[PDB]
Design a protein around this ligand. Structure first.
Ligand SMILES: Cc1ccc(-c2cc(C(=O)O)c3c(-c4ccc(Br)cc4)n[nH]c3n2)cc1
Length: 468
């Protein structure tokens, strides 16, 4: 993911491309903060293409809609031509990069938070590689910066700290008396005690800290390019709301004709899916039935800004409808402040004994762009959803959806995952927001789409602990 330059300007981007690149060279950078710019070289000139993400997907101007920036780049490199990634040397979005950090502070961190193989890189004008080894000690390796090249006092001179770190991860530096300086995993600084979330939110709100943590998580997306072949099949093309936002094959819900754009999320399980299309309503009810799901979480209006986000897949109040082999009666609608509850009865046509109640929780007040200013409404809604799921003996995974089923869906599921760890293990437990997002993202592409949702997840977890 070296093509992503987090701290450069358009002018700097143009100079890089016209001097260090050729025609077909490109890079992506953050813009209007929240937006992104694909800066490409074509015929000795630079084109700047806009990428928008209000929380649902990456929308490339003159292109398609994508689950991740890595996925957008992989597509255009396998299909203006995107030929040569212009590499970034800047290590700010690296998990191990701590910058302004002292030898005592680094030793504190490796001693408490660290285990064997834990390492970090901190900053005169030179850098330090601090490693923990044992079962233990901490070793400090000097990193000379000479003419914008990095070295450990001898051997190879690297173009960036990244190339240095990667090199010494594969071939570890061996101390004269046997000890191999293994770089096994970055120091896990994002793992915190739940009860101290407020202190971390304060530090993250300083000069922002939330932007560095999120982009460091975004940098790990290139490790999640799992196959999405079933979704690409000719027979399955129009079963997708967005042609390029597909389910991973290894986690997709298989229907026992077997396709739905949905994925099982294992942290109580979830099904992360898209908003129904006219032609997938019957596939949605087959899935709910088969999975034995008793709760559905809808986090979108049917129509937002004049565009259909999800078709009406449920009958009107008191009405009975058949959707293929599946039968649904809307028993009762209950309208709360932020949401509407719909009590549905699902059964197989021709089998009276298969009947079960499906509680549909429709959140109706989420803003068209961005996230709610306060998490109270979302938390209260999640609490009710949790209590319903809990009261139902042997219930299947909770179905969660919005439009593409990755942004608002991912956000709701992750909050639910974190507030659940707290429920079980109590206020004195460890929680790691990006480790949780990364674990959910390996089960469905681009789960949690923006920095605004990322910050909202932190605000949600903080507000839950405050009222505990
Ligand atoms: C100065 C400074 C600021 C922020 C960080 C930092 C550290 C980590 C980390 O590895 O603990 C991560 C992560 C993360 C965590 C686990 C997994 Br699996 C995937 C991503 N995401 N964002 C992060 N930011 C480090 C130094």
């Amino acid at each position: 993911r070296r093509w992503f330059h987090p701290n450069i300007t358009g002018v700097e981007a143009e100079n890089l491309l016209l001097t260090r690149g050729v025609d077909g060279s490109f890079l992506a950078r953050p813009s209007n903060p929240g937006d992104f710019t694909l800066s490409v070289r074509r015929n000795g000139a630079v084109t700047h293409i806009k990428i928008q993400n209000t929380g649902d997907y990456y929308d490339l101007y003159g292109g398609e809609k994508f689950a991740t920036l890595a996925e957008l780049v992989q597509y255009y490199m396998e299909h203006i031509e995107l030929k040569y990634p212009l590499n970034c040397a800047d290590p700010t979005s690296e998990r191990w990069f701590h910058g302004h950090l002292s030898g005592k502070e680094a030793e504190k961190l490796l001693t408490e938070k660290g285990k064997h193989g834990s390492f970090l890189v901190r900053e005169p004008g030179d850098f330090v590689l601090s490693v923990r080894t044992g079962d233990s000690k901490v070793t400090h390796v000097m990193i000379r910066c000479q003419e914008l090249k990095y070295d450990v006092g001898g051997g190879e001179r690297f173009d960036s700290l990244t190339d240095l770190v990667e090199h010494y991860k594969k071939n570890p530096m061996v101390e004269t008396l046997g000890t191999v300086l293994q770089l096994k995993q970055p120091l896990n600084t994002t793992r915190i005690n739940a009860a101290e979330i407020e202190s971390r939110v304060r530090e993250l709100s300083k000069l922002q800290g939330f932007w560095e943590e999120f982009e460091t998580l975004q940098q790990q997306e290139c490790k999640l390019l799992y196959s999405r072949k079933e979704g690409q099949r000719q027979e399955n093309k129009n079963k997708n709301r967005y042609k390029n936002i597909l389910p991973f094959d290894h986690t997709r819900v298989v229907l026992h004709s077997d396709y739905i754009n949905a994925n099982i999320i294992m942290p109580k399980s979830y099904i992360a899916t898209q908003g129904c299309l006219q032609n997938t309503v019957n596939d949605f009810w087959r899935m709910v039935f088969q999975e034995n799901s008793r709760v559905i979480v809808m986090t979108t209006k049917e129509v937002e800004r004049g565009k259909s986000k999800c078709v009406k897949y449920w009958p009107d109040e008191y009405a009975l409808k058949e959707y293929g082999v599946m039968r649904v009666r809307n028993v009762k609608e209950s309208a709360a402040h932020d949401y509407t509850l719909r009590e549905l009865k699902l059964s197989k046509v021709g089998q009276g004994n298969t009947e079960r109640t499906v509680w549909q929780y429709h959140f109706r007040t989420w803003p068209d762009h961005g996230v709610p200013s306060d998490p109270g409404g979302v938390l209260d809604f999640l609490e009710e959803v949790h209590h319903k799921q809990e009261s139902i003996m042997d219930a299947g995974p909770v179905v969660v959806h919005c439009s593409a089923g990755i942004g608002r869906t991912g956000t709701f599921i992750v909050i639910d995952i974190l507030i659940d760890i707290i429920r079980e293990k109590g206020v004195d437990c460890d929680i790691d927001v990006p480790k949780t997002i990364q674990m959910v993202r390996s089960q469905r592409s681009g789960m949690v789409q923006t920095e605004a949702q990322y910050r909202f997840i932190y605000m949600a977890v903080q507000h839950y602990i405050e009222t505990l």
